[PDB]
Amino acid sequence: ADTRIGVTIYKYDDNFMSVVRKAIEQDAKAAPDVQLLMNDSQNDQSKQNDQIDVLLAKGVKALAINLVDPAAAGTVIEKARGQNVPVVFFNKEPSRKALDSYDKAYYVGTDSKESGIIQGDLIAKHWAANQGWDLNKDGQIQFVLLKGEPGHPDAEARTTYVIKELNDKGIKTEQLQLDTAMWDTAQAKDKMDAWLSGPNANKIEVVIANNDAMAMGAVEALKAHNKSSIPVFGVDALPEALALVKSGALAGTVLNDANNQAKATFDLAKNLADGKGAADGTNWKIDNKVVRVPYVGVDKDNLAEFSKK
C-alpha cells in the first residue's frame, strides 16, 4: 500500500536544487505505491525543523532531507531516531561522526573537491589558450572569486581546490577580491558591480564563481560596464548556463549531475521505506553509507554532448 516519503528542499528558488526537486518528483511519478510530501524550507533551519516534526507526525516511512544548515544533521537524526525512521541526507553533506551515530542515516551527493579540481583544470586550459587574458602581462592570474555559503562542503572544497589545482599545475594566482554571494545571482551581480566601481576594476583578469547562478550575476554586471571581454567560470551546467557557454558569455562550467543524484536519493529512500536494504535491486555503489555521483567538466569543446540533444 501507500508508502509515505517526506522531502525537504532547503530553498525552492535555489537554481540547482530546483532541477533536483523536479527530477525527484518525476521519478516518484513512476512508483504508484509511493506518496511524496515535499516542503520548501525557505532557507531557514528553524522552519525545516518544524517541517520534519510535521512529517514524522504524519507517519512517513522515510525522510529525504536537504539541510539548510549542514551542522543541523544531529538535530534531524535525533528526531528520526525517535521513530526509528530512515533518513537519506542529500546535497548538503553532514559530518562523518553525524552519519555514524545512526544505523539508518545515509548520504547522497558528490566528492566536492573533484568539482574544484575540474574547474581549475578548465581555467588552466583556457588561460593557456588565451594569453590575451593576462592584462598586465605578469604571467599571473589576477582573479576575483564569488563564494557560496560559508561552511557548505561544496563552497569550501570548490574555493580551495580551484586555486590549489591551478597552483599545482604551475599557474601563479593573485586574489584581488573574495566574498560570498550565498549561491545567489542577485547578490553576485551587486558584489561584482561594487568591484567594477572601485580601485581594482581594471586589474581583474578572471572571474571564478562557486556556481552558475553566481556566475550569471557576474556576467550581467560585466555587461553593464562594457567589460564583456573578462572570462567567467561556474559550476553546475544549468541549462541556462549552457546557453552562455554557447554564446561565449561563460568560459566553462562543470556538470553537477542532478538527474542521478535525484534518482539515487529516491531509490535509497524507497528501499529503506520498504524495509529492503539501501541498494537492493539497484546498481548504486554505497561506500560506508554514502553514494557520490561524478562531476564532468563542460566548455565549448565538448558542449555538444551536454547541450540540447
Ligand X SMILES: OC[C@H]1O[C@@H](O)[C@H](O)[C@@H](O)[C@H]1O
**Which residues lie near ligand X (CB under 6 A)?**
14, 16-17, 91-92, 148, 154, 183, 211, 213, 235-236, 256
| Residue 212, annotated as binding a ligand | no
Query: Which residue's Cβ lies closest to ligand X?
Result: 16
**CA–CA dist 106, 265 (Å, integer):** 9
Residue closer to ligand X (CB basis): 62 or 68: 68
**CA–CA dist 173, 162 (Å, integer):** 11
Q: How far is the CB of 231 from Ca ion (least distance, A)?
A: 13
Residue closer to ligand X (CB basis): 110 or 271: 110
Query: Applying CB under 5 A, does 173 fall inside the site for Ca ion?
Result: no
Q: How far is the CB of 79 from Ca ion (least distance, A)?
A: 51
138 interface partner picked from Ca ion, ligand X, none, CB below 5 to 8 A per type: Ca ion
**CA–CA dist 268, 291 (Å, integer):** 10
Residue closer to ligand X (CB basis): 61 or 152: 152
Please tell me the count of residues contacting Ca ion according to CB under 5 A: 5
| Residue 45, annotated as binding a ligand | no
Residue closer to ligand X (CB basis): 62 or 293: 293
140 interface partner picked from ligand X, Ca ion, none, CB below 5 to 8 A per type: Ca ion
Residue closer to ligand X (CB basis): 159 or 271: 159
154 interface partner picked from ligand X, Ca ion, none, CB below 5 to 8 A per type: ligand X
Per the document, the length of the chain is 309
* Cα–Cα nearest to 259, from 16, 3, 15, 11: 16
Q: How far is CA 295 from CA 24, 39, 117, 254, in A?
A: 19, 27, 10, 7
Q: Which residue has the cell 556538470?
A: 255
Q: How far is the CB of 164 from ligand X (least distance, A)?
A: 18
Residue closer to ligand X (CB basis): 210 or 271: 210
Residue closer to ligand X (CB basis): 11 or 227: 11
Encoded one letter per residue, x for contact with Ca ion by CB under 5 A and - for no contact, window 118-157 reads ----------------x-x-x-x-x---------------
Q: How far is the CB of 267 from ligand X (least distance, A)?
A: 20
* Positions at the binding site for beta-D-glucose: 14, 91, 152, 154, 158, 211, 236, 256
* Positions at the binding site for beta-D-galactose: 14, 91, 152, 154, 158, 211, 236, 256
* Positions at the binding site: 14, 91, 134, 136, 138, 140, 142, 152, 154, 158, 205, 211, 236, 256
In the complex, the residues that contact Ca ion under the rule CB under 5 A are 134, 136, 138, 140, 142
